[PDB]
Every structure is written in structure tokens, then in C-alpha cells.
Symmetry: C4
Subunit: 219 residues, 4 copies
């Protein structure tokens, strides 16, 4: 039966039948957004949903027999597996993010269609060349985030009161979002010199970030 089904899985129909379901279930998830629509056709799309989830596991089952070890060494397939798994955890118990993480299946449209895969891949492959920078920066953030927790945390605990909080605040300064009126000016009402901490921090982080962008245009 193997070659029989290996001809079902590889079929242009089967793959395009999947793509057809993704665009359908996607359309169906934007409808589940409407409180109004749920009062009309709630039960329609709840069944239609459970339906698709089976179809996608049947596929991922069929997909596994045909590929065996090759399937659990394919990024795109591994993905597809995990995104269906999440979609399998019972409509109850534990966390309810799992009910929300179910919308992650529409990322299969990125998997089941090339060019998307191409472009996603094109994007990802730049990451390794950045890891050298990304490491530098994380050490940098970690260092300043400690100083800040221990320099501003007592008077300004919302923003720097915890190592995590300082990370968040520092991230926020880095995106330059409301950084002066929102943070440094307040801080300076108490700590006149806080500008000595954040201006250098901004230069560095802004400089480094600019280099990272030119690095991705040297290749």
C-alpha cells in the first residue's frame, strides 16, 4: 500500500487540497473574531474547525509513512507537525493560550507554498551572520540592565525595579520610544546625571544596530 499512498501524498491534488484548506480555515478564523458571527454560525465553524484538525493529522500521518526519518529532519515538516500538535491539545485544561496558539496553523500557508518558503528561508539565512552581533548586544543589554536595576530601581521601581524591568525599559529606550520625556527626564528630576547613562547607551546601541544593517548589505 506504501507506493499507492506515496502517490496520494506527492500528488499535486493532495498538496493543493491542503493549501485550499489553509485558506479556508484562515477565512474561518477571522470570522470567529466577530461576536456577532459566533451568535449566528458559531456551531458551524466550531465543527468545521475540528474537521480540519483531523484532516491535518491524517495528512501529517500519511506524510510520515511516506518520509519516515526524512520528515523529522525537515524544518518545514517538523514545523507543520508541531503547529498541528498545539492544535490538538483539548479545548480545556492547563493554559488557554493553547486555544489561541491554534491560529499559528495559518503559518502552514508559509510552509505548504514555495516562494513563501523561499522568502522565509531567504530571511532566516541571514541570522547566522548576525549571531556575532546579537551576542555582543545581549551581553551589553545584560550589563547595563544590571547597573540600571541597581542605579534607579529604588526610586523608580516600575521601570528599573527588577532585572527584568530594566531589560524592558532598556529595550524601550533602544527603540527610542518616548525615551526622553517618558523616562530619562523623569529620572533626571532625581538623578541629574542619568543622562550620562542613557546617552552613551543610545549611541552604542544605535551605532551597533546600524552596523548590523550595513553587515546585511555586505552580502
Amino acid at each position: 500500500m506504501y507506493l499507492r499512498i506515496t502517490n496520494i501524498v506527492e500528488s499535486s491534488f493532495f498538496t493543493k487540497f491542503i493549501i485550499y484548506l489553509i485558506v479556508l480555515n484562515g477565512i474561518t478564523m477571522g470570522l470567529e473574531t466577530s461576536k456577532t458571527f459566533m451568535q449566528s454560525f458559531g456551531v458551524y465553524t466550531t465543527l468545521f474547525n475540528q474537521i480540519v484538525i483531523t484532516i491535518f493529522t491524517i495528512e501529517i500521518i500519511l506524510r510520515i509513512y511516506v518520509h519516515r526519518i526524512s520528515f523529522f529532519k525537515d524544518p518545514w515538516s517538523l514545523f507543520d507537525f508541531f503547529v498541528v500538535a498545539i492544535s490538538l491539545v483539548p479545548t480545556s485544561s492547563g493554559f488557554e493560550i493553547l486555544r489561541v496558539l491554534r491560529v499559528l496553523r495559518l503559518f502552514r500557508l508559509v510552509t505548504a507554498v514555495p516562494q513563501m518558503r523561499k522568502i522565509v528561508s531567504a530571511l532566516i539565512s541571514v541570522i547566522p551572520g548576525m549571531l556575532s552581533v546579537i551576542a555582543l548586544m545581549t551581553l551589553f543589554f545584560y550589563i547595563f540592565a544590571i547597573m540600571a536595576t541597581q542605579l534607579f530601581g529604588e526610586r523608580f521601581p516600575e521601570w528599573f525595579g527588577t532585572l527584568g524591568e530594566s531589560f524592558y525599559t532598556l529595550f524601550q529606550v533602544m527603540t527610542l520610544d518616548d525615551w526622553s520625556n517618558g523616562i530619562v527626564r523623569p529620572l533626571m528630576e532625581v538623578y541629574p546625571y542619568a543622562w550620562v547613562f542613557f546617552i552613551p547607551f543610545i549611541f552604542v546601541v544605535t551605532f551597533v544596530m546600524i552596523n548590523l544593517v550595513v553587515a546585511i548589505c555586505v552580502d
Copy 2:
């Protein structure tokens, strides 16, 4: 009469006369802005406007004879038809946006002068080589916009209460506009972990956009 008028339309005088109307009507439309100017010369400029609009249809009526099917396959020509057409819809009924859309005719200064034509074209030609990335993002946006509507829209309906609103809010985060003090710090007063949604969201969307710019500095 065809070759006669094919020599009127195609003349340098015709074109340079058209350009002369645009820059004149453009000046007249900046004057219709002043409530003062309208209490003095409102009559002058309302007539002058209908005048140019006649002249512009006469010209477009002419232009079509000289080109027939070649005209309706020219982007720039199609444009002027549509833009004059909007200017044709009566100063009444329906919407008043049509009254406002009339100022779109000043885009003819782009259509009826080269280099502009060159520059616009230069720009537009970059779009197809973005469609792969653009598609990716619009799916990403759609996915999170759904996720966000169902994670935050009950307590925070202004921002995420509706699919559309999530799109708007997510766009705003993407432009990094007042995203932390304005939206996420609030959101975290109720959902401490909201930072787990927006920081990843920000990297992805920021990353991708850096590539789309590096892509345009390659082709």
C-alpha cells in the same frame, strides 16, 4: 480632421498649455483653502475651476481620438481619465469626498511632465520585487491581529477589540509609535506577559523590514 487634430494634440504647444493649467489650478486650490480668500474671490475661482475641468475633458476627448485603444492601455493616460472623471461628478449628492478627491488632478503635474514620470516609474518598479515580502507580512499581520483580538480585546477594546482595531494597533506598534508607554505597559497592568507577544512581534516585523530595505539596495 484626424491628422489635423493629431497635430493639435501632439503639439508642443498643447502639452505646455496643459502643464500651464495644472500649475495654475494648483495655485487656485491653495487659495480655496483661505476662508478669507473665498469671501472675496470665491466666485472667480469657482468658475475658473469649472473652466479648467471642461478644458481637461475636451483635451481627454481629443487625446482618445488620436490614440483609441493605445490610450486605454497607457497607465498615465488611464490615470488622467479617472482623475478628471472624479472632477466631473457633480458638486452634490452621495459623498463630499468626491469634492475633496478633485484635488487629485494636481497629480497630473506628475503624469504630464517627464523625469517625474521617470522618478515615479523608478519607484513603482521596485514594488514587484517586494511583493514576496509584502505578502509574507500581510499574513503575519493577519495572524497576530487575530491572536491579539482574542487575547486583549475584552479588557482593551479600544485597541484590540475588533479585528480591524488590532490591525491598526499592530501597525502602530510596527511604526514603533508610542508602543511601550502607550500600549504595552498598560496592557501589562492586566496581562503581565503581554511583553511576550509584542517584543517578538517587534523583532520579526523590524527584521523583515530591514531586509526589504536591503533587498531594494541590491536590485
Copy 3:
């Protein structure tokens, strides 16, 4: 005496003496900032200033005889003339900006010291190859500023009340500064569809500006 003075002017000492004055009058102007310093050395500096102004008009007079027509065809020289000229308008009558505009003479450090001239020129030289874009944009800004004044200026006259005001608001949106919480969300409380005007505006204006930068990163 002409070759005597052409040997005075063209001398290294002359140039290095001018540069020496600029850095001194520059230092002396940062001191006229202090209300404290002015109460202890106000006169010291005001005389020193009137002094330097002489020394620079003497120089410019010398400089002119040595170059005649070659001078009023040198940008950098013209500059120095006009900048010193400003410094010549009496401490009274007229606008008081001319008193403030005096500090523009410190830009002579750019003009009278090479490598600044180089870098400045290097910068300026990029402007012509942007005039095509810059014109495009200005037309665009002009067209939308008109639309916005007649779409939003009745209920929102601070922001869009006048054609000039619209320009400013539109500039602000383009620098993406507090555009959503600060402007469009307000505007939407009245004009729900205002988002239809500002999102496309942002796309266009942001797109164009990316091209203009990639344009520069090619020439």
C-alpha cells in the same frame, strides 16, 4: 602694495590666525550663555566680540582685493561675506534674530578649515541627485496638505486648520512622531475613516524615503 597684501592674505599665518579667532570667539559665545559669566565678564566679551567683527571685515576687505571677481564666485567666500554681514547689523533696531544669527559665524570654522569643506561639499553634492525625489514629495505633501485642510480643519483647526498647519502636521506624521495616539486616534473619534487617509500617506511617504536613501547608497 597688491603683491605685498596678496602675500599677507595668502600666508599660512593669516589663515591659521583666522582659524585661531573662530575657536576663540566660539569659546567666547558659549560663555555669553551664562547669565553668571555675563555679570562678571560681560564687558570683557562684548568688546572682544566687536573686536573680532572688525578683524573679520578687515580680512574680508583684504580678501576681496586679492580675488576681485574670483571671490564673489566662490561659495565659501560668499558665505563668509554674508555671515560677517549679518554680524555687522547694529546691536539694535529691526528684528533681534539678527543678534542671534551672529552665532552663524562659527560656521566659518567649516569654511576656513579644509576637510570640513571637503565633507560638507561631499554632503551637498548628493542633493542634486535627490531633487527629482524632493520635488515629487513636495508636490505630494502639497496635495495632501490641501486635502487635509478641507477634510479635518473644521473640527481640528490646531492641527489642520490652515494649509500651513496641515503641512506641519503632515511633516510630523512623516517623522512618525506620536502620529497615532497623538493625532489619528483623536481624529478617528470624529472621522472614523481618517485611517484611510493617514495609513496610505505613511506608506507612500515612508516608501519614497527608503528609495531616496537607497538612491544615495548607489551614486
Copy 4:
């Protein structure tokens, strides 16, 4: 005893041992952040902290006998000295920022591990190609900072009342952070024409910065 210790210092186990202490002491400093943790294992830490500092001076002492003058001509080696030095100043007295500055030793992770060294150096090496532009800007900032202090500092002394404040505010406009609703719109409630000062300032500063970025995308 020299070649004995020269072989100890140059040993891989020596280096790897240091890198081990850094990643250990880094983890220790992040724990000193928890107010909870210090009530539990503060003592455990503070003594381990002094231990590491002992070890690190010993290393730097060893490293000097084995390099002499070659040491104090090595940037990285100099760094480590001036970093451990900081950590040597007692837990008491005059500036307590020194207790905070101790955390700068985590930058030794950059100094000891290569690749980081590589990347940091790659970053630094872009600086000299910017000094021509940096100097230009700093002169620019200085000139406008002066004009502003004397144009706006009487009514707006928070923002422009002092040369330093003008510098800060001008930096903030440059990062485009809350520059219009936050600052210029206010300023215009008194000085209608303040837009004549800041829009040009923004262009220049924005333009320049774009060139500096492209200038890097060359070298």
C-alpha cells in the same frame, strides 16, 4: 621562574579558567539583583565576589611579567587593567558609582573570548571613517544649542535654559522622540516661528545621519 609562569599564563587552561570565572561572576551579579537572594545568600556571594577579584589581579599581575611593555600597549590588556582597577577601590567612600561600575568586568567576556574581539574591533574600525562627519555634527549641535539657549530659554528654561539643556533637547529632537507635541508645538504657543528653527534643524541632522550610514555601507 619566568618561562615557568610564561607557560602557565599562555596555557589554554589559564585562559579557559578566566573565561569560566567571568561567566560565573556574571551569573553571580545577576543574582545580587534579587533583594530576596541577598537576604538568603548575600554572604555566599560577597565573599565569592572578593575571591574573584583577588584571582583577577593575580592574573593581571602574572600577565604583566610575561608581557611587560607589550601589555600596556595592548588595548584589550589595558582595558582589563582599568576594569579590575575599578573593582579594587574599596566598598566605601566618595563616589559609590564605583560599586556599580564594578559590573563593567563582565565586558572581560568580550576581551577574553575572541570572535567578540573580532566583532568589537570590526565595529570600532568604522569609527575613524566617521570622525570627519562627527566633528561636523558636533560643531552644528554646538551652534544651534547656543542659538536655542538664547532664543527659548527664558520662557522654556526646562528645555533650553542652559547650554547643556539645549544640547539635551536638541539631541532629543534628533532622535525624533516626541519632538512635535512634546516640544515644538509648545514652543510655538509663544514663538510662532519656532518651526523655522526646528524643521531646518531636523532636515540637516537627519540628512547628515543618512549619509553617515551610507558612508559606512561603502567601507
